[PDB]
Design a protein around this ligand. Sequence first.
Ligand code: OLC
Ligand code: OLC
Ligand code: OLC
Ligand code: OLC
Ligand code: OLC
Ligand code: RET
Length: 231
Amino acid sequence: ATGRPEWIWLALGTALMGLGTLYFLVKGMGVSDPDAKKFYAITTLVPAIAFTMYLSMLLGYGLTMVPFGGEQNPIYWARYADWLFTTPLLLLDLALLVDADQGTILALVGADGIMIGTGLVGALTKVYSYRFVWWAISTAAMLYILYVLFFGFTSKAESMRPEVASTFKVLRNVTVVLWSAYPVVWLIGSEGAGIVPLNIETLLFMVLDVSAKVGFGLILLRSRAIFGEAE
Ligand SMILES: CCCCCCCC/C=C/CCCCCCCC(=O)OC[C@H](O)CO
Ligand SMILES: CCCCCCCC/C=C\CCCCCCCC(=O)OC[C@H](O)CO
Ligand SMILES: CCCCCCCC/C=C\CCCCCCCC(=O)OC[C@H](O)CO
Ligand SMILES: CCCCCCCC/C=C\CCCCCCCC(=O)OC[C@H](O)CO
Ligand SMILES: CCCCCCCC/C=C\CCCCCCCC(=O)OC[C@H](O)CO
Ligand SMILES: *C/C=C(C)/C=C/C=C(C)/C=C/C1=C(C)CCCC1(C)C
């Protein structure tokens, strides 16, 4: 375990996702409003899944070796198992906040599945040049998601309760900045061109993951937007 220099960031990531899960679980105890219950359930599940997949990486289960470029390269495949389930949940929190129509939700979740699934194929591909073909397809799926969040969701939020509009705008901006960083880290890190070493890459994804999951949830669950309007 300690024989891998990145273990300290995996240990810190496990601890922070675990503590985040417990805080949201205790906070949501006794919430009775049905609309608020939905946001607490979605938002508490996100760090609980990431906790399990950080632990699997720390203990060494979620790592495999992929030959390319005449080397055996360590690839943490557990990240994609986490993101397959947690990235659609985070998009569902945003879509429920703006009362998105069912067709737009399906479009978003399906494009997200394509983004993560092609990321995994690129991560496990043994022909070096083809890894970047899958990266480009996955990045095109991400750009579709960001387009909808700006030119679909913003338009509808603006016609809703003012607290819904202001909380959506903030969460939208957090999401666009943080999600856009992931394809860059992958391209310069050990899965791509190999310029940044694996221990620094693991630090960068841990800062991004905690911010995009526990930071995002702290903003959302402190807002009055998740409660129905009631006397
Ligand atoms: C909100 C409060 C928390 C704030 C925390 C945010 C920091 C995020 C981490 C960033 C990158 C820093 C990576 C550390 C730099 C190591 C690079 C290096 O030193 O490599 C040298 C090499 O030996 C010769 O080139
Ligand atoms: C050190 C601590 C480690 C971290 C803990 C280990 C995580 C794995 C265990 C359990 C799943 C617990 C339940 C996860 C689902 C929570 C959903 C929820 O909060 O629902 C609220 C809603 O209001 C209800 O109707
Ligand atoms: C609303 C939807 C909520 C969805 C909640 C789902 C949470 C699932 C969490 C965790 C375990 C993931 C386990 C992944 C198992 C992969 C095992 C495997 O195939 O390993 C192959 C081989 O043995 C070695 O490489
Ligand atoms: C493996 C990747 C896929 C599984 C990962 C799990 C992610 C979340 C699940 C589903 C999105 C499907 C559409 C769900 C949108 C329904 C929300 C809605 O429109 O409202 C309906 C409600 O009945 C009004 O009262
Ligand atoms: C809209 C927000 C999301 C946008 C996300 C898409 C961004 C794509 C950016 C850049 C490609 C730059 C490629 C630079 C890679 C060259 C690396 C190389 O081979 O150089 C060797 C190294 O520099 C010797 O030390
Ligand atoms: C909880 C973790 C989050 C919000 C992770 C988000 C991950 C992405 C937006 C990843 C995107 C990628 C690409 C667009 C292309 C290359 C590979 C990926 C999967 C890193």
